[PDB]
From Swiss-Prot, chain A:
GO biological process per UniProt: proteasomal ubiquitin-independent protein catabolic process; proteasome-mediated ubiquitin-dependent protein catabolic process
Family as reported in the entry's similarity comment: Belongs to the peptidase T1B family.
UniProt organism field: Saccharomyces cerevisiae (strain ATCC 204508 / S288c)
EC number: 3.4.25.1
GO cellular component, one term: cytosol
Job description of the protein: The proteasome degrades poly-ubiquitinated proteins in the cytoplasm and in the nucleus. It is essential for the regulated turnover of proteins and for the removal of misfolded proteins. The proteasome is a multicatalytic proteinase complex that is characterized by its ability to cleave peptides with Arg, Phe, Tyr, Leu, and Glu adjacent to the leaving group at neutral or slightly basic pH. It has an ATP-dependent proteolytic activity.
GO molecular function terms attached to this record: endopeptidase activity; threonine-type endopeptidase activity
Catalytic activity reported: Cleavage of peptide bonds with very broad specificity
Top-level EC class: hydrolase
Name of the protein in question: Proteasome subunit beta type-2
Gene3D superfamilies according to UniProt: Glutamine Phosphoribosylpyrophosphate, subunit 1, domain 1 (3.60.20.10)
PANTHER family: METALLOPROTEASE TLDD, PROTEASOME SUBUNIT BETA TYPE-7
Compartment(s) of residence: Cytoplasm; Nucleus
UniProtKB/Swiss-Prot annotation, chain B:
Matches recorded under Gene3D superfamilies: Glutamine Phosphoribosylpyrophosphate, subunit 1, domain 1 (3.60.20.10)
Role noted for this protein: The proteasome degrades poly-ubiquitinated proteins in the cytoplasm and in the nucleus. It is essential for the regulated turnover of proteins and for the removal of misfolded proteins. The proteasome is a multicatalytic proteinase complex that is characterized by its ability to cleave peptides with Arg, Phe, Tyr, Leu, and Glu adjacent to the leaving group at neutral or slightly basic pH. It has an ATP-dependent proteolytic activity.
Keyword Aminoacyl-tRNA synthetase: no
Protein name: Proteasome subunit alpha type-6
Organism name: Saccharomyces cerevisiae (strain ATCC 204508 / S288c)
From Swiss-Prot, chain E:
Swiss-Prot/TrEMBL GO biological process terms: proteasomal ubiquitin-independent protein catabolic process; proteasome-mediated ubiquitin-dependent protein catabolic process
Subcellular location: Cytoplasm; Nucleus
Organism superkingdom: Eukaryota
Any one GO MF annotation of this record: endopeptidase activator activity
Listed name of the protein: Proteasome subunit beta type-3
Gene3D superfamilies, per database record: Glutamine Phosphoribosylpyrophosphate, subunit 1, domain 1 (3.60.20.10)
InterPro entries: Ntn_hydrolases_N, Proteasome_beta_3, Proteasome_bsu_CS, Proteasome_sua/b, Proteasome_suB-type
Main location: cytoplasm
Keywords: Cytoplasm, Isopeptide bond, Nucleus, Phosphoprotein, Proteasome, Ubl conjugation
Main function: Non-catalytic component of the proteasome which degrades poly-ubiquitinated proteins in the cytoplasm and in the nucleus. It is essential for the regulated turnover of proteins and for the removal of misfolded proteins. The proteasome is a multicatalytic proteinase complex that is characterized by its ability to cleave peptides with Arg, Phe, Tyr, Leu, and Glu adjacent to the leaving group at neutral or slightly basic pH. It has an ATP-dependent proteolytic activity. This subunit may participate in the trypsin-like activity of the enzyme complex.
Disulfide-bond pairs as recorded: none
GO cellular component: cytosol; nucleus; proteasome complex; proteasome core complex, beta-subunit complex
From Swiss-Prot, chain I:
Subcellular location: Cytoplasm; Nucleus
Organism: Saccharomyces cerevisiae (strain ATCC 204508 / S288c)
GO cellular component, one term: proteasome core complex, alpha-subunit complex
CDD domains tied to this protein: proteasome_alpha_type_4 (cd03752)
Family: Belongs to the peptidase T1A family.
Site of covalent link Glycyl lysine isopeptide (Lys-Gly) (interchain with G-Cter in ubiquitin): 85, 184, 216
Additional detail: Present with 17100 molecules/cell in log phase SD medium.
Function: The proteasome degrades poly-ubiquitinated proteins in the cytoplasm and in the nucleus. It is essential for the regulated turnover of proteins and for the removal of misfolded proteins. The proteasome is a multicatalytic proteinase complex that is characterized by its ability to cleave peptides with Arg, Phe, Tyr, Leu, and Glu adjacent to the leaving group at neutral or slightly basic pH. It has an ATP-dependent proteolytic activity.
Name of the protein: Proteasome subunit alpha type-3
TM regions (residue ranges): none
Subunit and partners: The 26S proteasome consists of a 20S proteasome core and two 19S regulatory subunits. The 20S proteasome core is composed of 28 subunits that are arranged in four stacked rings, resulting in a barrel-shaped structure. The two end rings are each formed by seven alpha subunits, and the two central rings are each formed by seven beta subunits. The catalytic chamber with the active sites is on the inside of the barrel.
SUPFAM superfamilies xrefs: N-terminal nucleophile aminohydrolases (Ntn hydrolases) (SSF56235)
Length: 199, 228, 176, 243, 180, 228, 75, 227, 230
């Protein structure tokens, strides 16, 4: 919402916002999907849909908890679990509505009654999908790492070891893993004047 | 009932039957058409011998004409509307309204006030005349939006005589073209036939005439001494 | 130029000139350019008078001191701000304090024993900085105005024509 | 009538909306020292018609549940607006789901806004809302068509309400734990019931201490997840063995 | 004076917050506290706005605001100005009135919860005081030793002109304000 | 807004029957100017002039007088004044009077079937297109041109002598003593500068309202003419 | 000035106006007129000076019954 | 409109007179209801601006909103011109709002009549205007509204000539207390009066000062009995 | 006729709503409302029934539909806090009751709405006129008072106020007369401490601010043990 505008341009002629410039991964695996970030960057849209975020941190926390409100209301209005493509549609519509002026770069990964999925939203509302992605500025090393050492159907353990390697490329990590029958798993940091009165 | 959109137990519309009762209250007017020109005669009203007699001929940029057979203000709403409807068609396109859509536009616009909940229809019979890309035209309009191109007709209280005369003499006007002469006089005889014991005079009577290379010129002025 | 200058003394609020009464115990002054600097003063004067019609009573100098900056900030939140200084002061007929407040162009607020504006206006401020006494008398307050005028046209490039001076006190607004 | 006053200051149209509430298939709720219960009878039609789609009881926030008597469509829109309010006025400013007091104030406003606005009849439902606030605790409210809301220790609304509150005024006392409230509530709807008494003619749901097993993820001990539980027909048919 | 310093520090059942000379930029709301480095316009606009919101909350919810809930209130209310964000570094503080936990948090201008629980620094200055504060601190002090090191941290943060400071000590069921 | 069994609006007719018991305003046109005059009734001798002025200026060329609640038409008269002077401010001409009379009496149509200004009205004035012109206006939409016309309780009874007692070549003073002779006809009263008020409307005077002193030399002139 | 100003202020109704244009081209003159006439007897009949929220049945005709905008948390 | 003027005929008697250099307004006011407080009680007579007053009879609830609407207009007129609104222009607006709320179904008319009065700068004519539910503005040199106003209007029209405005505030106040004393069988503590002199000298009269007028008229009336 | 029939019936509506009293002191104000006959299962501290707090320095004792009153109470809070944000200074009680009493005429002005069925006894303090006590009713008129009642049996309560009220008395004297009044105008066979609500306003702890307590049901017992029965 637009208030206090046309005045800051004169006052600047400004505190910097807390951008996360770090690096994050998602890898699709034998029974689910993994995501991780080089830490708190692992926001929840819902218990089974998770976002690793990058860029302006306040934007990522605000929009994920707004879409997570839409999706919590949605699960209560249908009596069904939400889908990764529901979150992807709503982030596309919602980040298109705010035209990349909200600055979040944002993975979406999750499990739902249809299957396991992995997508990413860039600032323009543009979307990518695949068996793996990496985002936040360290990712050019993780391109090579994931393309080289991923294979058809890594299980939990190798996907967590590959995540460790991908984020290590480009000293500590947050990781969360969504497994198709089970509660999603969250792992943190895995790798001499005086006067007085009562007031 | 008096309700403006509601239908009677027999399927009737009492609001439009009473919009047509304004024909049983407005003072007579009559009109007719030929190969090249068309004519209407309006007979007027007054409050006292002193009073100035009522205006009932108008035009739309010397391209169309109009008369009233009931409430002049309601016919004036349709007059100003159609006159601006012919003003935007002229200036925006460099074209003209050929008279075909004038009948349609009235018949759209008058049906709507019986259609919506809102203010009542224009409570008056109207006669519109003009000249096209081909030929002169007469349109009778009737409330709730009927258009009919009647070859001759008369409207207002007890006007059955002037209809009977335009029917009774299909010569003298249908065949008449080039110069306007007998159109004016024959129409004037039909209205002059209709009055029971009342009078015809040089201010009291006025004629609309339209057609090929007559820019619509209003005839209530002293030139009407040529046609009484 | 046109510096607005104002000093508080134990007796009164003193203003020196772009100046207005708002109400029977409030003066204000409004150094700044043509248009909104002048024109905003009408809206405050109108609505505060609407209050002192509508109540059989007057707002404090505090009430107006904040209300002016709420509206000044508000009127500019959808604009660029403009070169303005608003100096408010009045006599509080509950506390018997004379009071003075400076509002800068962005809509600051600062409660003071004196206020100012303008470049060479800092000379006046430095003279007040030398001279002030905790409870200055009226005659010394008027002499501090004499003292700042006595430097101002000497330190200025030219005779910019000094001041016109006014008081708020318990006896209502007075002019000199 | 459009809810304008009658010749002794009665609202007219609201007394008939209370009679729509009065005609509904019963619901009741109890405050218990460690939790709160919400209870209602379902009906549907033949064994052709399920009673097990969108339930009669429903979750408003992770810690508040609701149940009703009267016109179902009115209740169903009130709860689905009520869910939207909790997120757009509380959760997206404060980061906390609204305590029972505030979300009941908001449902009460939608009902009052109907006993005064243009072109609208009152809503024909009374809403029992029950849930847990960390600061003032386990709580029960009734919201009526009039928009007025009363907090209670226990209450019942609709067809069975007179018997059910006569029973709960004879029964409820300041020592009851959650489970014996359920054993009175079951015996109460065992006397609201027009049909057979069983684990699909009765809905029954609870607020107690949380279940991190229902958070659908773990790893942040901070979060406690759901305060409210929808009992399954099996969880109900266990307790229906004792009654 | 054109840009404030606020410093914040933690100990067993206690917290300290410190502030500039003049108009102290430590505002208070019964039992939550808000330092604000920023432009004086926005600093008083945030007090006007949070007096309004915190009185509405204090009236509506039948309890005053707690530090964590105030943290999220200032976060979402700065995000309400995402396109025109106030020029501020709020530094909220308090003891949570139910649990007795210390709480401190900082923010950027658009409401990020900068949850730096060790100590919190906020200004246009910062760089020297962050280096002093991490060096002078030790964990789990009592109120007076907590006061001695935060007062040393400000007395070393003082550029060499001298001008004093205000130090709040905020504690489980007590608050005191020292004009240092 | 509503129709009758006979073609006419009840919201107009059941309003207009009020002005039939309203103040008896009368006007006369002549070769030399127009006269306009009224029963100067007051609720008490305590009422000052310059309040409910039952006759008013519109511009130096035009006045008004009326018979129902003047404050209703006073709203229409605000617009009549402002619309007239804005024509002149834009185009440097007085709006030719009949075009003002339509534009000021068109307010009773607001764009349909309207609740009435329950007051009939007498615009009168000068232009070079049709001369000194005396009109009439209504909660409908109507006209007159130049003769005598009247409104209010005595008016149609007065109209029977107004039609008789007039001709084109009259000078203004003839209409002045003629407007006093008629204004006495039904009031049960001695007219004077307290029970009657007058105006003369000319190229030399503009619109002007007779001063109480000039109302005592014209009533003296009629009173000494009573011996004729 | 700001590139998103006015564009977002009118987004609520402007998207609804364009959605009525799709209703025209896919279902003819009947459905947008039917809905915009429902819009006029639902929005204009909400007379209640103390209630500025708008109308509860508007979202039952507007698809906002189960969704949030920043504009709905930041009124 | 007809039932609405019976609201005025149900409202308190309000009255006034012009003078050569003042206007006096007053009202029958029901004193105080045993437990009511005067300082916490609204006057009936009400200021609109330092040079303009409004008094009234009928719906006091509608009269708050009528005066509150007049107060925003009177200040807006002043703001928009620095023309401290002339009484004839203040009257136009207030009469206009009673026209506006007559004309429609929905927003039914203000159930109120007013005396509006004041002094333009340097206009020593006391402008007094009376308005009613329809939005007339009959001016008067003296007038009565409210209930029982028969004997008030009869007694006033027997004691004043429109060409006889008393200059002295003494006689100005003396006439009006006699007039109200015909109606107030409840005794002359119930009356309230207020005066405008030119150039913003609007002045209220105290409960003691009106008594030096009730016990000046009373012994004058006893001297008229002994005569 | 000069009458409004919905509005006379809205006044008949507040006449059903149970009795409520308010009495001023030479230094403070008191409020005292009856909760009518009530079921054993009602909660007794969570139930917002008759009294409320509208800012730091103003309260209300209401009779009506509580649902109607809640919206006016909320708008008084919003207006009071927006005034306090506008002028950096407290809202006078009279301005606040004017603003709420306008709304209650602005609906009565109209056919598209019913008027609010709520009366409102306001207590508050300001640095305009000190302690102020106001009363406001369904047509939107308002009046100041020293001692007043609203709702059911208003007249019988004002007959008990009329002769007993002495103009100089302190807050803790008025706490007697409120219960002498309510118990003589009782709508129940007898009182119990849970059936009534009270709130008070006083000059700070001592000087400076204002003190503005709501009595919880034990504090209501503490004022009933006094001026009680034997």
């Amino acid at each position: 919402s637009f208030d206090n505008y046309q005045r800051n341009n004169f006052l600047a002629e400004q505190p910097k916002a807390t951008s996360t410039g770090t690096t994050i991964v998602g890898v699709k695996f034998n029974n689910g999907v993994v995501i991780a970030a080089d830490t708190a960057k692992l926001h929840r849209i819902s218990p089974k849909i998770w976002c690793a975020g990058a860029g302006t941190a306040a934007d990522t926390e605000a929009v994920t908890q707004l879409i997570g409100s839409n999706i919590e209301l949605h699960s209560l209005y249908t009596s069904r679990e939400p889908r990764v493509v529901s979150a992807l549609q709503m982030l596309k519509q919602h980040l298109f509505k705010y035209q990349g002026h909200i600055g979040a770069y944002l993975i979406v990964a999750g499990v739902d009654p249809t299957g396991s999925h992995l997508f990413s939203i860039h600032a323009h509302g543009s979307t990518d999908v695949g068996y793996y992605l990496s985002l936040g500025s360290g990712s050019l090393a993780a391109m090579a790492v994931l393309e080289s050492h991923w294979k058809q159907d890594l299980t939990k353990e190798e996907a967590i070891k590959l995540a460790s390697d991908a984020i290590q490329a480009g000293s500590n990590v947050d990781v969360c893993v969504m497994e198709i029958g089970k509660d999603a798993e969250y792992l943190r940091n895995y790798l001499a004047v005086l006067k007085e009165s009562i007031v | 009932d008096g309700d403006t959109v509601t239908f009677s137990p027999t399927g009737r519309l009492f609001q439009v039957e009473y919009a047509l009762e304004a024909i049983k209250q407005g003072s007579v007017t009559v009109g007719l058409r030929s190969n090249t020109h068309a004519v209407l005669v309006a007979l007027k009203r007054n409050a006292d011998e002193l009073s100035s007699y009522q205006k009932k001929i108008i035009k739309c940029d010397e391209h169309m004409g109009l008369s009233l057979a009931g409430l002049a203000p309601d016919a004036r709403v349709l007059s100003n509307y159609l006159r601006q409807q012919c003003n935007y068609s002229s200036l925006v396109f460099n074209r003209k309204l050929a008279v075909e859509r004038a009948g349609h536009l009235l018949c759209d616009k008058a049906q709507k006030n019986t259609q919506s909940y809102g203010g009542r229809p224009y409570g008056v019979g109207l006669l519109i005349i003009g000249y096209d890309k081909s030929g002169a035209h007469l349109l009778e309009f009737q409330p709730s939006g009927n258009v009919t191109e009647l070859y001759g007709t008369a409207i207002g209280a007890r006007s059955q005589g002037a209809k009977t005369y335009l029917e009774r003499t299909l010569d003298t006007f249908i065949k008449i073209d080039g110069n306007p002469d007998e159109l004016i006089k024959a129409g004037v005889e039909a209205i002059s036939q209709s009055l029971r014991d009342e009078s015809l005079t040089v201010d009291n009577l006025s004629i609309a005439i339209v057609g090929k290379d007559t820019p619509f010129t209003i005839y209530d002025g002293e030139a009407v001494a040529k046609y009484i | 130029m046109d510096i607005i200058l104002g000093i508080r003394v134990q007796d009164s609020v003193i203003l020196a000139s772009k100046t207005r009464q708002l109400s029977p115990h409030t003066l204000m002054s409004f150094a700044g350019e043509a248009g909104d600097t002048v024109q905003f003063a009408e809206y405050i004067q109108a609505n505060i008078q609407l209050y002192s019609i509508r109540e059989d009573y007057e707002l404090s100098p505090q009430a107006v001191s904040s209300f002016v900056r709420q509206e000044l900030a508000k009127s500019i939140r959808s604009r660029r701000p403009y070169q303005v200084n608003v100096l408010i002061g009045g006599y509080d007929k509950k506390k018997n304090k004379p009071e003075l407040y400076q509002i800068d162009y962005l809509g600051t607020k600062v409660e003071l024993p004196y206020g100012a504006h303008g470049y060479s206006g800092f000379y006046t401020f430095s003279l007040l900085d030398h001279h002030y006494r905790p409870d200055m008398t009226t005659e010394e307050g008027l002499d501090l105005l004499k003292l700042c005028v006595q430097e101002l046209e000497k330190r200025m490039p030219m005779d910019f024509k000094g001041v016109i001076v006014k008081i708020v006190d318990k006896d209502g607004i007075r002019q000199v | 009538s459009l809810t304008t006053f009658s010749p002794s200051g009665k609202l007219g149209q609201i007394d008939y909306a209370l009679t729509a509430v009065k005609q509904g298939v019963t619901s009741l709720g109890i405050k218990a020292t460690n939790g709160v219960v919400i209870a209602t009878e379902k009906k549907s039609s033949s064994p052709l018609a399920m009673s097990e789609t969108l339930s009669k009881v429903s979750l408003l926030t992770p810690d508040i549940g609701a149940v009703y008597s009267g016109m179902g469509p009115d209740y169903r829109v009130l709860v689905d607006k009520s869910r939207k309010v909790a997120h757009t006025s509380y959760k997206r400013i404060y980061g906390e789901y609204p305590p029972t007091k505030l979300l009941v104030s908001e449902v009460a406003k939608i009902m009052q806004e109907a006993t005064q606005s243009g072109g609208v009849r009152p809503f024909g439902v009374s809403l029992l809302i029950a849930g847990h606030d960390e600061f003032n605790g386990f709580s029960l409210y009734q919201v009526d068509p009039s928009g007025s809301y009363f907090p209670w220790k226990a209450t019942a609304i609709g067809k069975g309400s007179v018997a059910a509150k006569t029973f709960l005024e004879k029964r409820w006392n300041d020592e009851l734990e959650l489970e014996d409230a359920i054993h009175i509530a079951l015996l109460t709807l065992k006397e609201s019931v027009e049909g057979e008494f069983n684990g699909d003619t009765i809905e029954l749901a609870i607020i107690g201490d949380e279940n991190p097993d229902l958070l659908g993820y773990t790893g942040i001990p901070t979060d406690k997840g759901p305060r409210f539980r929808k009992l399954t027909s099996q969880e109900i048919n266990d307790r229906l063995e004792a009654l | 004076i054109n840009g404030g310093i606020v410093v914040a520090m933690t100990g067993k059942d206690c917290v300290a917050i410190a502030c500039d000379l003049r108009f102290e930029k430590i505002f208070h709301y019964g039992h939550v506290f808000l330092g604000i480095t920023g432009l004086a316009t926005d600093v008083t606009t945030l007090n006007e706005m949070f007096r309004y919101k915190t009185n509405l909350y204090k009236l509506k919810e039948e309890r005053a605001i707690e530090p964590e809930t105030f943290t999220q209130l200032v976060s979402s209310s700065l995000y309400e100005r995402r396109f025109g964000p106030y020029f501020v570094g709020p530094v909220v503080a308090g003891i949570n009135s139910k649990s007795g936990k210390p709480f401190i948090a900082g923010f950027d201008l658009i409401g990020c919860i900068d949850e730096a629980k060790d100590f919190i620094v906020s200004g246009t200055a910062s760089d020297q005081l962050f280096g002093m504060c991490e060096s002078l601190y030790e964990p789990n002090l009592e109120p007076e030793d907590l006061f001695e090191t935060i007062s040393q941290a400000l007395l070393n943060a003082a550029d060499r002109d001298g001008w004093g400071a205000v130090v709040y000590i905020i504690k489980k069921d007590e608050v005191v304000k020292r004009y240092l | 807004s509503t129709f009758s069994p006979e073609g006419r609006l009840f919201q107009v007719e059941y309003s207009l029957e009020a002005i039939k018991l309203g103040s008896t305003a009368i006007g006369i046109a002549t070769k030399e100017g127009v006269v306009l005059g009224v029963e100067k009734r007051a609720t008490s001798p305590l009422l000052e002039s310059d309040s409910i002025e039952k006759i008013v200026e519109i511009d130096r060329h035009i006045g008004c007088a009326m018979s129902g609640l003047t404050a209703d038409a006073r709203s229409m008269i605000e617009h009549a004044r402002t619309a007239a002077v804005t024509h002149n401010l834009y185009y440097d001409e007085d709006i030719n009077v009949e075009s003002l009379t339509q534009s000021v009496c068109d307010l009773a149509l607001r764009r349909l079937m309207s609740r009435p200004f329950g007051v009939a009205l007498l615009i009168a004035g000068h232009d070079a297109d049709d001369g000194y012109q005396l009109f009439h206006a209504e909660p409908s939409g109507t006209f007159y041109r130049y003769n005598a016309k009247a409104i209010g309780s005595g008016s149609e009874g007065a109209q029977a002598e107004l039609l008789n007692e007039w001709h084109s070549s009259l000078t203004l003073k003839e209409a002045e003593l003629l407007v006093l002779k008629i204004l006495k006809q039904v009031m049960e009263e001695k007219l004077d500068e307290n029970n009657a008020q007058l105006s003369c409307i000319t190229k030399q005077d503009g619109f002007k309202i007779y001063d109480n002193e000039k109302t005592a030399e014209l009533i003296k002139e009629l009173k000494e003419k009573e011996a004729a | 000035r700001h590139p998103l100003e006015s564009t977002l202020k009118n987004w609520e109704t402007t998207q609804r106006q364009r959605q009525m244009e799709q209703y025209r081209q896919i279902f003819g003159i009947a459905e947008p007129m039917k809905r915009t006439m429902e819009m006029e007897i639902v929005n204009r009949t909400d007379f209640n000076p103390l209630s500025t929220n708008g109308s509860i049945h508007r979202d039952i005709l507007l698809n906002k019954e189960c969704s949030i905008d920043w504009e709905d948390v930041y009124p | 409109v007809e039932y609405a003027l019976e609201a005025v005929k149900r409202g308190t008697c309000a009255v006034g007179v012009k003078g050569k250099n003042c206007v006096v307004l007053g009202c029958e006011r029901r004193s105080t209801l045993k437990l009511q407080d005067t300082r916490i009680t609204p006057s009936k007579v009400s200021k609109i601006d330092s040079h303009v007053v409004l008094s009234f009879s009928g719906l006091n609830a509608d009269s708050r909103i009528l005066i509150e609407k007049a107060r925003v207009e009177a200040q807006s007129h002043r703001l928009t011109l620095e023309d401290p609104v002339t009484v004839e222009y203040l009257t136009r607006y207030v009469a206009g709002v009673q026209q506006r709320y007559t004309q429609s179904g929905g927003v039914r008319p203000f159930g109120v009549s007013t005396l509006i009065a004041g002094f333009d700068p340097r206009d020593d004519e006391p402008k007094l205007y009376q308005t009613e539910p329809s939005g007339i503005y009959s001016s008067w040199s003296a007038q009565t509204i409210g209930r029982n106003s028969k004997t008030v209007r009869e007694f006033l029209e027997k004691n004043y000539d429109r060409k006889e405005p008393p200059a002295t505030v003494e006689e100005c106040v003396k006439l009006t207390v006699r007039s109200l004393l015909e109606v107030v069988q409840t005794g002359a503590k119930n009356i309230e009066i207020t005066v405008v002199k030119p150039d913003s000298d609007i002045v209220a009269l105290s409960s003691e000062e009106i008594n030096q007028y009730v016990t000046q008229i009373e012994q004058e009336k006893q001297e008229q009995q002994e005569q | 006729e000069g009458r409004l029939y919905q509005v006379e019936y809205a006044l008949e509506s507040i006449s059903h709503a149970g009795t409520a009293i308010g009495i001023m002191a030479s230094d403070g104000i008191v409020l005292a409302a009856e909760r009518k006959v009530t079921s054993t299962l009602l909660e007794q501290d969570t139930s917002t029934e008759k009294l409320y707090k509208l800012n730091d320095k103003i309260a209300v004792a209401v009779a009506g539909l509580t649902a109607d009153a809640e919206i006016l109470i909320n708008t008084a809070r919003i207006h009071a806090q927006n005034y306090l944000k506008t002028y950096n200074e407290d809202i006078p009680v009279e301005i606040l009751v004017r603003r709420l009493s306008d709304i209650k005429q602005g609906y009565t002005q109209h056919g598209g709405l019913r008027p609010f069925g709520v009366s409102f006894i306001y207590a508050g303090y300001d640095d305009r006129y000190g302690y102020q006590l106001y009363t406001s009713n369904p047509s939107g008129n308002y009046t100041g008072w020293k001692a007043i009642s609203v709702g059911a049996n208003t007249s019988a309560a004002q007959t008990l106020l009329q002769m007993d009220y002495k103009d100089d008395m302190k807050v803790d004297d008025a706490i007697e007369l409120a219960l002498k009044t309510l118990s003589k105008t009782t709508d129940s066979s007898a009182l119990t401490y849970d059936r009534l609500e009270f709130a008070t306003i006083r000059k700070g702890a001592n000087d400076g601010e204002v003190y503005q307590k709501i009595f919880k049901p034990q504090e209501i017992k503490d004022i009933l043990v006094k001026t009680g029965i034997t």
